[PDB]
Design a protein around this nucleic acid. Structure first.
Ligand code: MG
Ligand code: MG
Lengths: 239, 239
DNA sequence: CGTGCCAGGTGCCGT
DNA sequence: ACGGCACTTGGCACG
């Protein structure tokens, strides 16, 4: 079928081969319901025993294997990986990524369903409420930080690390912002501390770090105060 | 129902409702190829225009929407979400996470396929090469760091943060390790630096930080040296 | 390309 | 639950 969808339940091997072939050839979406084994070797090494999973191969090369639980595929393979279907005692999907070299091997013990989905999507996701949006707010409304704040750079490389927003205040200090779109953790305060220390090595003792977020974890608040750093409450804007 | 798979191409709304509702009640995997619009509101806010996607709803509430590219769902919902099918101008899949309130709405414009996959999986993933396994190696073979190293605590909480490994050396110094199973970057060093500074205040300047990892980024090397910390090369072990 | 970092990050484990 | 952090993190923007 050259309808959007082809489905075959309990395929024969040649049926199985046929659909996998066409999926790849047509830049379609291959979906398989099968009982399988999965072997991964790559950055790490992985084994998964016999069980039912859903398998998806995207035309861009992405490979997903999902069990009945979580949000995360049990094994996978990133965009740009090449897949082929080898016939050994059972059919085996083999997907290889290079740089770094990673091979994914799915032995298909029984294929309950194979399907080809020739999917048209021209639309891109529009997302609001991000950190960049916070940045834009600050550049178009600096008073949202403090009065007379003068934002200068965004995503600026200082020597070691990249600062979210860099600027000055009314009294002439350098001011660093670390923004976070959620509750700020130790991770963030360490970013901020790191930057501020580097800027001090040049502009000496007049520099302020300011952590801009909707809130802080206990430890963030703790460490923040300890190192004499500041916090301003800010929500990411939605539009 | 006994069949692993139930699938219907071009299903009527009646047929859709049957299988969708069966999927939830039977606690099975729902799979749908469809033309759809997507609306997300939650931590952020999101709009996806009309186009074709694969949709998976797992019995544990996890909800996936995959376009024909990348590895990441364009929208999703975490485990423990609750989904209902709603009949409005078109069928709408509605997944609601509470705690934090997050709403996903999938308007099904045309459903090309709906399927129920009753998947039996008793197997769990066995992965090796983790950072945890790095730590285990070090406690079994402390010499992989340096002669005379005596590892003592693992994931030990110092006042602010949690140190991966705390130990002592031949000079009887307190020693911090941060482990990375892959090439270490600036925040690895920031972590280490953070911990060490905290301990220096208790135990003095004797205290050594060591970054333990298969390799370093240029930037990490730079900050490491600048702060007088150390680097030991270690590859994560694979069973 | 490698470096650095956000992400609706997710998952895990501790208190 | 909140916290602190690893993850085969993935994906992006920038030098
Ligand atoms: Mg930053
Ligand atoms: Mg660690």
């Amino acid at each position: 079928s050259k309808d959007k969808v082809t489905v075959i339940t309990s395929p024969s091997t040649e049926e199985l081969v046929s659909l996998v072939n066409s999926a790849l050839l047509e830049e379609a979406m291959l979906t398989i319901f099968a009982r399988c084994k999965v072997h991964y070797d790559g950055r790490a090494k992985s084994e998964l025993g016999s069980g039912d999973r859903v398998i998806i191969v995207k035309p861009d090369g992405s490979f997903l294997i999902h069990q009945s639980k979580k949000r995360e595929p049990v094994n996978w393979q990133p965009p740009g990986s090449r897949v082929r279907l080898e016939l050994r005692e059972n059919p085996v999907l083999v997907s290889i990524r290079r740089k770094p070299r990673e091979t994914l091997e799915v032995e298909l013990e029984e294929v309950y369903m194979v399907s080809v989905f020739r999917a048209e999507d021209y639309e891109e996701l529009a997302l609001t409420g991000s950190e960049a949006e916070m940045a834009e707010l600050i550049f178009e409304n600096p008073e949202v930080i403090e009065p007379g704040f003068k934002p200068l750079f965004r995503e600026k490389a200082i020597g070691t690390g990249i600062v979210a927003v860099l600027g000055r205040d009314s009294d002439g200090n350098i001011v660093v912002l670390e923004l976070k779109r959620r509750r700020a953790e130790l991770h963030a305060v360490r970013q901020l501390k790191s930057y501020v220390e580097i800027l001090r090595e040049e502009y000496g003792d007049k520099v302020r770090g300011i952590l801009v977020a909707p809130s802080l974890t206990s430890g963030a608040k703790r460490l923040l105060e300890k190192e004499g750093l500041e916090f301003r409450k800010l929500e990411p804007p939605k539009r």
